[PDB]
């Protein structure tokens, strides 16, 4: 569980929740995925600001699977690790 | 080439190549936050918040002792950066 390792999920201007993705036919069986709490980002006054967006940061990771559902197959999956705040103006 | 959030984020980052011939994958791209603060509404680095790396625990392959035997090692990699504040709302 990443909640016990880091609390950036609660302190970020683009906070997130962690959801357990369970699969017995896959190794690791449990994968924790970040889901952005808001569409906007939290501003200085504590309000959800829609001049920016919370977006998930994804990582391509290889996983082990039992196929057909002796043999194992290495499968590529995309996982959300956390969220960042993006703006339409690049400085 | 897959995502440009590194340039559009209020906590932007650069990607650095971590090379290791005794590890598979040999090359791992790691995020390094560009600034200590975060980019505010006016385009300035704001030090009332901090850019922090989001790290992921990932398994890698290593040659141990340093051609026949390998070890599966859990490593920590920075995937990107987020902006944190000292006031939680």
């Amino acid at each position, epitope marked *: 569980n990443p909640k016990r390792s880091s609390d950036y999920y609660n302190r970020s201007t683009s906070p997130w929740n962690l959801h357990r993705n369970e699969d017995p036919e896959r190794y690791p069986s449990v994968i924790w995925e970040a*889901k952005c709490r808001h*569409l*906007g980002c939290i501003n200085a006054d504590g309000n*959800v*600001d*829609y*001049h*920016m*967006n919370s*977006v*998930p940061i*994804q990582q391509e990771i290889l996983v082990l699977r039992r196929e057909p559902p002796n043999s194992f197959r290495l499968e590529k999956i995309l996982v*959300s690790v956390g969220c960042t705040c*993006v*703006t*339409p*103006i690049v400085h | *080439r*897959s*995502s*440009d*959030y590194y340039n*559009r984020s209020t906590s932007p980052w650069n990607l650095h190549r971590n090379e290791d011939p005794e590890r598979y994958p040999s090359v791992i791209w790691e995020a390094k936050c560009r600034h200590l603060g975060c980019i505010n509404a006016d385009g300035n680095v704001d030090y009332h918040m901090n850019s922090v790396p989001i790290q992921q625990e990932i398994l890698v392959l290593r040659r141990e002792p340093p051609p026949n035997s390998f070890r599966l090692e859990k490593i920590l990699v920075s995937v990107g950066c987020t902006c944190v504040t000292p006031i939680v709302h």
Partner: antibody, heavy 118, light 111 residues
Framework: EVQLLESGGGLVQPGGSLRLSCAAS????????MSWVRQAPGKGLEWVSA????????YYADSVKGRFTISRDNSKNTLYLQMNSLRAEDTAVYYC???????????WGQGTLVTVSS | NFMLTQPHSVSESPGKTVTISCTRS????????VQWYQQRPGSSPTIVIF?????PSGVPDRFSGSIDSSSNSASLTISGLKTEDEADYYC?????????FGGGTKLTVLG
């Protein structure tokens, strides 16, 4: 250079279905929210639907709720719009649009004409 | 839901300054970015202004965007009006769910 190429338009009978595609190139597709906007001949621009970069969040105009489905294939750099229960009022040029954030469109495609008629 | 009201048409002589307004019916205008698009006959819309006042490269310095929170309206101003500025102009903004375009303004360059 940003390129958005729509396909799939043509004639549909009222009550029929049609799927539109938009092939994107020149930008990192999966990091952009995308939109569909339509325009009936000699009329104004009308927002239809939007989708987050990941595809995790979707948004619809009241006029198309339940009938249309926006989706994307990030491995194919393609945006789709599935339209069911089409009616004469859905006749329009449909544009694919790239958004910098939700609601801020930065680029438009060439459009594809959809005609709903018996 | 909300609406954006724009004038049906605006007119001015060459070299003059023209302003096109866009009034939001509900919700605070300053909470959400305003975009302006130009549409020429038989063409796709092109962006003139994004994020209230940002001008992309290729858009003349004559085009500028502004917002007025007191009146809950945004404006597209064209200084030194040219005949090539004849086109339809649309304002656009959003809320946390919807995206809305104004009805559009036909710009006529007089004389």
């Amino acid at each position: 250079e940003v390129q958005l190429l729509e396909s799939g338009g043509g004639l549909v009978q009222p009550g029929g279905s049609l799927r539109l595609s938009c092939a994107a190139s020149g930008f990192t597709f999966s990091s952009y929210a995308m939109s569909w906007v339509r325009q009936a001949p000699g009329k104004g621009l009308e927002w239809v639907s939007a989708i987050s970069g990941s595809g995790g969040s979707t948004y619809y105009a009241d006029s198309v709720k339940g009938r249309f489905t926006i989706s994307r294939d990030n491995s194919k750099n393609t945006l789709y719009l599935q339209m069911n229960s089409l009616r004469a009022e859905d006749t329009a040029v449909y544009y694919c649009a790239r958004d910098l954030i939700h609601g801020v469109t930065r680029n438009w495609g060439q459009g594809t004409l959809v005609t709903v008629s018996s | 839901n909300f609406m954006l009201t724009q004038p049906h048409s605006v007119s001015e002589s060459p070299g003059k300054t023209v302003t096109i307004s866009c009034t939001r019916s509900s919700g605070s205008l300053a909470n959400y970015y305003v975009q302006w698009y130009q549409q020429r006959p038989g063409s796709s819309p092109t962006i003139v202004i994004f994020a209230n006042n940002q001008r992309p490269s290729g858009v003349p310095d004559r085009f500028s965007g502004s917002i007025d929170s007191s009146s809950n309206s945004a404006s597209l101003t064209i200084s030194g009006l040219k005949t090539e500025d004849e086109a339809d102009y649309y304002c656009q903004t959003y809320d946390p769910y919807s995206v809305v375009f104004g009805g559009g303004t036909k710009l006529t360059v007089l004389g």
